Amino acid sequence: ARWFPKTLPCDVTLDVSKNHVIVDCTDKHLTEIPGGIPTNTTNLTLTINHIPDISPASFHRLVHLVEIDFRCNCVPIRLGSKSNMCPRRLQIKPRSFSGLTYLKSLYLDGNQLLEIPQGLPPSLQLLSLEANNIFSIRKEQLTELANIEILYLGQNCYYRNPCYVSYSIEKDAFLNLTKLKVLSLKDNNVTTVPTVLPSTLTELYLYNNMIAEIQEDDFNNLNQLQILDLSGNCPRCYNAPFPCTPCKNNSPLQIPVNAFDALTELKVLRLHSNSLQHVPPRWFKNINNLQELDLSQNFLAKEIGDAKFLHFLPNLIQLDLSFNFELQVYRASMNLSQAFSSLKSLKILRIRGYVFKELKSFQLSPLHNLQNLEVLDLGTNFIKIANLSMFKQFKRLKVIDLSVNKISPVLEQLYYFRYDKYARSCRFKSCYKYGQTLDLSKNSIFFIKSSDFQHLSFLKCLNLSGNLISQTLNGSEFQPLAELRYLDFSNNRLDLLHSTAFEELRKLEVLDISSNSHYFQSEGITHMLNFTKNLKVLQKLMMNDNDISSSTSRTMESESLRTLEFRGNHLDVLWRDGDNRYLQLFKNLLKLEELDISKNSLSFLPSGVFDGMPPNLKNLSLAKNGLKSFIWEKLRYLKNLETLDLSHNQLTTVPERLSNCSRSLKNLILKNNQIRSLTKYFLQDAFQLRYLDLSSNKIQMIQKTSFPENVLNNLKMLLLHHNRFLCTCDAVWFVWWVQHTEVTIPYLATDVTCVGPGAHKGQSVISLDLYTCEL
Amino acid sequence: ARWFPKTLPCDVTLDVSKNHVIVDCTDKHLTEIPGGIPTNTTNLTLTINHIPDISPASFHRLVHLVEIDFRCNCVPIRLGSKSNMCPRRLQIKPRSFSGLTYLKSLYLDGNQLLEIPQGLPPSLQLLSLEANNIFSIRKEQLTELANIEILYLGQNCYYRNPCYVSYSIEKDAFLNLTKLKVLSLKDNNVTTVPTVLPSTLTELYLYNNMIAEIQEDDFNNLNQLQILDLSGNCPRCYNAPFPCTPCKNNSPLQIPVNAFDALTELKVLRLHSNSLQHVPPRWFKNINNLQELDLSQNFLAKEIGDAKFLHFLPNLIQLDLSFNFELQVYRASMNLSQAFSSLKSLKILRIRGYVFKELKSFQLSPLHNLQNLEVLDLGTNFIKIANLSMFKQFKRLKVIDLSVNKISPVLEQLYYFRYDKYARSCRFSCYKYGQTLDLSKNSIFFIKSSDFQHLSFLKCLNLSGNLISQTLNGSEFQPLAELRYLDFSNNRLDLLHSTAFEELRKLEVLDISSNSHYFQSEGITHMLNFTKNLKVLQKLMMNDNDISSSTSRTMESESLRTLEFRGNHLDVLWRDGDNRYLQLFKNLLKLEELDISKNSLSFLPSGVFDGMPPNLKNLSLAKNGLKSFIWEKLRYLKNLETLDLSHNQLTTVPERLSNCSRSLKNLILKNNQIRSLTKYFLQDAFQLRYLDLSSNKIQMIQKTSFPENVLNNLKMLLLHHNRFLCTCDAVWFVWWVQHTEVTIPYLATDVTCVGPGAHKGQSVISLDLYTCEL
RNA sequence: UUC
RNA sequence: UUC
C-alpha cells in the first residue's frame, strides 16, 4: 500500500492548513542529524539526543525551517543524566543558521553553551538559551537580534548550574531590541534590574536572583508591561527544600513606593518569597488593572489583618497569601482585615500556611459579599476546630479547600515550596465538575454524624479522603447531604457491617471507598458488599486496594451501576477452586459496562466466572494478575465485550481463532505476557477487531495466515514493539508487510528490532533489506 | 577439583552417622525418575514432578531405600496448577515396592490414586495417601499393613477434591493393625467414628467430616489416646470462607456424657466448630491429664459465664474459647465465670470473638490468682473502652493481646476461620523483650501519659495500626520506664519536636515505619535528629515514610547499630547540587546496618559515601533504579562487608574490584543489566566470599575475570538466569562449573545455554564440548 | 502443586 | 535529560 517505506527515525506530520512539515526526532539516541529529513520541513525537533555539533551541513537543504528545537543535546552535568554525561559542550560552527531565511524560533537550551550564538538570521523572533553557561550579556552580542520578540536566558547560573560569579549585563544591553516583548532572566544570580529595558516589554521574569533593591526608575519606561515576576529575591528560606541564602539582617526586597507607577497595563505581579513584612498601599496607586497578585512565602501574617492595599485592587481576580506565618507561632484564630470586602472581582483566594487553631464563621465575614468568589483555599493550616456549617454562607463557591488540616470532633503536591514551578522540561515546550466541593481530605476526622453537615445540603462533592474514619456507617451519618453526587471516602477505615451504609445519599453518582482495607484484613468480620442495592442513581463505584477476600453477601446488586473498580482485592480467595458461592458476585449489577478486576492474584480463572458476569459488560481488565492460562472460548459468554485487557500476565498462547471466541471484541490488550508465537489463523475473520497490542512479548515470527489483510486494514493501531523478531528468510512476508503497511504501529524507529541472526542483531526491521532471500 | 561432574538434577547429601544417602529431586520438572541415582540412596524425594508411573524398574537398584517421598505427581485438578493439569492419575505397576525390604515411609499423597496400593513391604511403618481419590476402606486392602504405625488418609473427599458419596469404612477395618498409633481421616466426608479401632492409637484425627453423633463406646478401648480432634463436625458456618454445610435442626455434634471415660491418657481435645451450646462437666470426669482444649467456633457465649466443667481441668495448660459470640449480639461486657479460678495450671487463655463493648478490671478477677498464666488473648472483640491500667494485676504475663479492637479515648492472619490449618503442602516480633501489651489495630487517636499509669513493667508496646496523628514531645509515655520495644508503625506521627520518645530511656527498638502522612505535605517541619536523646537505641525503622525533606541536616545517635530507611525519597534529599543532607547519617557513629533501598536513587551524588558513618558493614541500595555507580568510591567504606545492589539497572562491574574495597565479603548484583564482566574483575579480590550475578544478561565469563584463586574461596556463587553463549570460547567456564567445589544453586534448572542453536536451552552442567578439543 |  |  506504501511504495516507499519510511525509514527516518523521526515522526513526520503534515498539517497543510498551516503548511507545516513537522519532523519530531525527540529522544532517538541520535549522534548526528539523520539523513533524509524532508526538504520541506518547517518544524524540526531534535531535543534529547547526543548530536555533538552543528554546521552549515546540518540544515543545508532545509531552507524552509521556521523552527529548530535543538534542546538538551549537552545538558549541564548536575541537570543531566549521570549515566550518560555529556563529555563536551555543543559545537556551533560559523554559518550554521544564517542561510535559514525563514527561521522564527530557535531553542538551544541545555547545551552547555558559553556565549550567545552569532550569525543568527534577522527573521528570528524567539531565541531560547536556558540551562547553558552564559552569564555575561554584552550589547555587541545582541545586535544580531534586532527583530527578536522572545528571549529566554534563565537557569544559566543557579545552584543546579553554578557559574560562581554574579551575572553581568551591560548597561542598555537590551534597549535597542525595539521589538522585545518577553525577557526571562530567572535563576541567574542577577544582582540588579538591568536598565534601560525596551518599552515594548510585556513580560519580565527576574525571579530567583540576588536582587536586593529595586530602584525607583528601574521600571520607568515599561508602560506596556503586563506580567512582572520578582519572586525569590531576598527569599524566605524556612523549610526550603533547596539551598537558600536570605538577604542579610532578615531584610526584605526593597521596593520604592513609586516603583510600579509606570505600569498601568500590569495584570500579573508575582512577589513570592521576597521576605516582605508590609505591602504599601502606595505600590498600587496607578495599577487599576491588576488581576493576579502572588504574595505567598513572605512575612505578612500581621499585614493580613490590616491590608489597606486591598482597597486599591477592585479588579483583582486571584490573590495568594499562603505561607506567611510567623516562625514558631500557632495563632488562635485567623484575622482577615475588613479590607478584603473591597476585592469585588475576587475569584480565587488562597491562604495556606497561616497556621491557626480554630476557624470561626465570623472570621470569614469580610468575604461574605464577594460575589464572584469561587475558590477559598485554607489548606495546610493545622486547623483543629471548624464548624463546617459556616459554609452555608458560601454556596456560590466552586471549591472550599480545607485539605491537610487537623480538623476533628488543582495544584500539584509540590507547589509553594519548589524552586521554579514554571521551569521547562527537556522534553516539552477530580470531582469539581460535579459542582460545589468541600475538600476535607487529609484531616483527623475519626467519627462523623449527621449534624456535622447541617446546612450543607447544597454540596455536590465531599472529599473525606485520608481521614481516620473507623466507623460502621448505617445510613444516618450524611443525612443533610441531599444533593451530593460524589463522595470520596478513600483512605479511611470504613466498616461495611451494614448494607444500609451511604443509603441516605440518594443523589450519589460516584462513591470512592478505595484503600479502606483495615477491616477486610481481619478474619471472621462481617462485610456487606450488597450495600449498592439502595443507591438508585449510583453510576461509578471504586473499591480498589481493599484486600477483600471474604464477603457475607454473595451478590452485589444495582440497577444503575455502570463502572466498578475492584482492583487490588483477593478474588483469587473468593473464587478458590471448588468454592462456587461468589461466582455471581457481579452478575446482578445489571447495567455494568466496565469492570476492573486487575491485581487480584488470579493466576487462573475458575469455570463459572465468565458465565457469572453481568450481561452488558463491555470493558474488562484482568491485568496484573499473574494469569498463567486462559480458556479463550469462555469469552463467548460475554456477548457485549468490546475491550479485554490482559496486560502484564503470564500467558503463553493466543487462541487458534480469535473470531470463534468473541463476536464483539474490538480492543485486545496482550502486552507484557510470555507469548512466543501466534496461532496459524489467529486473526482469521476477526472483523470486529480494531486494536491489538502484542508488545513486550517474546514473539519470533509472524506469518500471513495469522494476520489477514482484511482484518489488518481495519485496525486503528497494532503494537508489536519489544518482541524477539527473527529476521531470517522465513520472515520475508512480515518484514515486507511492516515496511509497507499504512496501519499505525508505534516505535518502528526505536523498538521493532531484530534479535537475530548474528548479522542483523539490533537492526530495525523497517530498515531491513532481504534481497538475498530473492536471488 | 572434582574428577566426576555431578550431572544428576537432584541434590545429594550424606549424613554418615545415620548412613543416609539423601537424594532430593523436589520440583525439577522430571517426567521420569532420573538415571544414576546413588545405589546407596536411603531417602528419595520426588515430590512436585510429572512422573506418570512407577514400576519394578523405578527403584530396582535402590535396595536400601528407607523413605520414598513421591507426592504430588498427579495432584487432583482443583488442588493443582491450572496451567499444568495432570491428565491421568499416577500408574503404580505390580511389584514396584515389594523389593524395597527396608522401606518404612512411603508418601503417595496428591496423585489421584483410586485404591490403597498393594504389594507393600512388611517393613512399612508410615503410609501417606492424602489428596487422592480413595474413599472406601476395606479390611482386605489393609492386611498388607500389619506393622504400620502412621496412616494418613485425609483430604480424599472434601469440597476441593470431591468424591460425591459418603466415605465408607468397613467394620473393624483397622482393628488388626495392632501397631497403629496415628490415624488421620480428616477432610473425608466421614459419617461415623469407625469401630472398632485398635487400642494402640495415640492420635486420632476425625475433623472436618459429617459425623453427627458419637456413640457411647466409639472410644471405649482407646486408653492410650493422647490426641483426639473431632472439630468441624456440625460446623458453625457463620462467615466461613469455605463452602460450609451445618448439621440440620441447628444441632451440635452429639457427644454422650460418658464418651471420653476411657481416654485416661488424653492430653489434647479439639472440639472446634462443633456448634456446641453446652459443655457437660461429666465429659471430663476420667480425664484430668488434659492439657489442651480447643472450644473455639461454637455457640458457648452463655456457657462462658457458667462453665462448671472447668472445675475438672486443674492440669489444663491451654484453653481456647474464641469466636463463641451469639449472632447479632453486641454484649456490654465480658462475663467470665468464677470457675476460671480453678484452672490452676493455665498458661494460655484465648477468647477472641466474644464481642463486647467494655472491658473492666473486675471482669478479669477470676484470673487474678492463675500464677502460671502467660498469654491473655482478647483480640477481635470490638472492645471500645478499656482502662489499660487494669493490667497492673497481670505483670506476670508474657503477652496481653488486645489487637484488632476499637479501643479509643504467634498465630497467623488466618487461623480461626480456615478450613484445615494443619494441612500439608506439596513441597514440605517483640515477645523476646519481655512483657508485651499488643494494642495494634485499634482506634487510639490520642495518647497521654496517664493512659499508661501503673504499666511501668512493660517491655514491648505495640501501637501499630492505630490512628495516632499527634506531635509527640517526650511526655506521652512517661510511666513506661522499662519499655525496650515500641512499635509505632502505621500511624500518623508528626515529628515536629526533636524530644519525641526521649522519655523512653530504656528504648532499644523503635519502629516508626508507615507514618508517611505528615511527610507527604510540603512545607511542614520534621525533626529527624530526635535520635540524639535515646542513649540505648540499637535499631530504628523508618521505612515507607516518603521522607523527602528534613529541617535538621544530621541524625545522631551514639548507640544506633541498625537503621532501616527504605521507601523514602533520599533522591530528593540528595538532589544534585544540594549538599546539605550528604552527612545525614554520618554521626550515627555506631551504625553497622543501613537499608536505603527503594529510595528512587537513580544515581548517587558524590559525597554520599564520604558521608557514611565509619563502621557501616551492611549497606542495601537495592530497588533504586540505579543506572550508574562509581565503584571506586567504595574506598570510603572501610568496614563494608555486605553490599546489596539487587534490582537496579547497572550494566558494568568495576575494572578491578580489589581496588574498590579491601574488605567487601558479600556482593549482591542480582537482577541488573550486566552483559559482560571486566577483563580482570575479581583479580586478587581474596576477601570475597559471596557473589550473586544471577538474573543479569551475561553471555561469557573468562578466567581473566574469574581467577580460580578467588573463585574457590567463595561460599556461594550465583549465576542462574543469565545469557550464556556455549561456544568453544566458553570451554573454561563450562569446565569450571562442571567440576567446581563452590556451591552454585539451580544448576539443574536455570544455568542454561541460550545458544548457539544446537545447545539452546541446554544446561551447562550437561554440556559436552569435545568438538572444541579435536 | 494437599493450606 | 532545565522541574
Ligand SMILES: *[C@@H]1O[C@H](CO)[C@@H](O[C@@H]2O[C@H](CO)[C@@H](O)[C@H](O)[C@H]2NC(C)=O)[C@H](O)[C@H]1NC(C)=O
Ligand atoms: C552567585 O554569585 C556569587 C558572587 O556574587 C558567588 O559567590 C562566590 O562563590 C565563590 C565560589 O563559590 C566564592 O569563592 C566567593 O567567595 C563567593 N562570593 C560571595 C560574595 O559569596 C556564587 O557562587 C554565585 N552562585 C552560583 C550558583 O553560581
Ligand SMILES: *[C@@H]1O[C@H](CO)[C@@H](O[C@@H]2O[C@H](CO)[C@@H](O)[C@H](O)[C@H]2NC(C)=O)[C@H](O)[C@H]1NC(C)=O
Ligand atoms: C529419611 O527417612 C527416614 C525414614 O522415614 C526419616 O526418619 C524419620 O524421622 C522422624 C523424625 O522424628 C522419626 O520420628 C521417624 O521415626 C524416622 N523414621 C525412621 C527412623 O524409620 C528421616 O527423617 C528422613 N530424613 C530426610 C532428611 O528426609
Ligand SMILES: *[C@@H]1O[C@H](CO)[C@@H](O[C@@H]2O[C@H](CO)[C@@H](O)[C@H](O)[C@H]2NC(C)=O)[C@H](O)[C@H]1NC(C)=O
Ligand atoms: C459427601 O456425601 C454426600 C452424600 O452423603 C454427597 O452428596 C450427594 O451428592 C450427590 C451428587 O452431588 C447428590 O446427587 C446427592 O443427592 C447427595 N446426597 C446427599 C445426601 O446430599 C456429597 O457430594 C459428598 N461430599 C463430597 C465433597 O464429595
Ligand SMILES: CCCCc1nc2c(N)nc3ccccc3c2n1Cc1ccc(CN)cc1
Ligand atoms: C506551615 C508550618 C510549618 C512549621 C510547622 N510544622 C509543623 C508540624 N509538623 N506540626 C504542627 C502541629 C501543630 C501545629 C503546628 C505545626 C507545625 N508548624 C507550625 C508551627 C507552629 C508553632 C510551633 C511552636 N513553636 C511550631 C510549629
Ligand SMILES: CCCCc1nc2c(N)nc3ccccc3c2n1Cc1ccc(CN)cc1
Ligand atoms: C466476630 C464478629 C463477627 C460479626 C461482626 N462483624 C462486625 C463488624 N464488621 N463491625 C462491628 C462493629 C461494632 C460491633 C460489632 C461489629 C461486628 N460484628 C459483631 C456484631 C455484628 C452485629 C451485631 C448486631 N447489631 C452485633 C455484633
Ligand SMILES: *[C@@H]1O[C@H](CO)[C@@H](O)[C@H](O)[C@H]1NC(C)=O
Ligand atoms: C511550528 O513552528 C511555529 C513557529 O515557531 C510555531 O508557531 C508552531 O507552534 C510550531 N508547530 C509545531 C507543531 O511545532
Ligand SMILES: *[C@@H]1O[C@H](CO)[C@@H](O)[C@H](O)[C@H]1NC(C)=O
Ligand atoms: C487584626 O490585626 C490587625 C493588625 O494586626 C489589628 O489592627 C486588629 O485589631 C486585629 N483584629 C482582631 C479581631 O484581632
Ligand SMILES: *[C@@H]1O[C@H](CO)[C@@H](O)[C@H](O)[C@H]1NC(C)=O
Ligand atoms: C455549628 O453552626 C451551626 C450553624 O449555625 C449551628 O446550628 C450549630 O449549633 C453549630 N454546631 C457546633 C457543634 O458548634
Ligand SMILES: *[C@@H]1O[C@H](CO)[C@@H](O)[C@H](O)[C@H]1NC(C)=O
Ligand atoms: C480528594 O482528595 C485527595 C487527597 O488530596 C485527592 O488525591 C483526590 O483526588 C480527591 N478526590 C477527588 C474526587 O477530587
Ligand SMILES: *[C@@H]1O[C@H](CO)[C@@H](O)[C@H](O)[C@H]1NC(C)=O
Ligand atoms: C445508626 O447509627 C446511629 C449512630 O450510632 C444511631 O444514632 C441510629 O439510631 C442508627 N440508626 C439505625 C436505623 O440503626
Ligand SMILES: *[C@@H]1O[C@H](CO)[C@@H](O)[C@H](O)[C@H]1NC(C)=O
Ligand atoms: C444483604 O445480604 C444480607 C444477607 O447476607 C441480607 O441480610 C441483607 O438484607 C442484604 N441487603 C440488601 C440491601 O440487599
Ligand SMILES: *[C@@H]1O[C@H](CO)[C@@H](O)[C@H](O)[C@H]1NC(C)=O
Ligand atoms: C476500558 O477501561 C479502562 C479502565 O480500566 C479505560 O482506561 C479504557 O479507556 C476503556 N476503554 C474503552 C474502549 O472504553
Ligand SMILES: *[C@@H]1O[C@H](CO)[C@@H](O)[C@H](O)[C@H]1NC(C)=O
Ligand atoms: C466456532 O466455530 C465452529 C465451527 O465454525 C462453529 O460451529 C461454532 O458455532 C463457533 N462458535 C462461535 C461462538 O462462533
Ligand SMILES: *[C@@H]1O[C@H](CO)[C@@H](O)[C@H](O)[C@H]1NC(C)=O
Ligand atoms: C505489632 O502488631 C502488628 C500488627 O498486628 C504486627 O504486624 C507486628 O509484627 C507487631 N510488632 C511487633 C514488634 O511484634
Ligand SMILES: *[C@@H]1O[C@H](CO)[C@@H](O)[C@H](O)[C@H]1NC(C)=O
Ligand atoms: C508536651 O505536650 C503535652 C500535651 O500537649 C503537655 O501536657 C506537656 O506539658 C508538654 N511537655 C513539654 C515538656 O512541653
Ligand SMILES: *[C@@H]1O[C@H](CO)[C@@H](O)[C@H](O)[C@H]1NC(C)=O
Ligand atoms: C535538632 O535540630 C534543631 C535545629 O535544626 C535544633 O533546634 C534541635 O535542638 C536539635 N535537637 C537535637 C536533639 O539535636
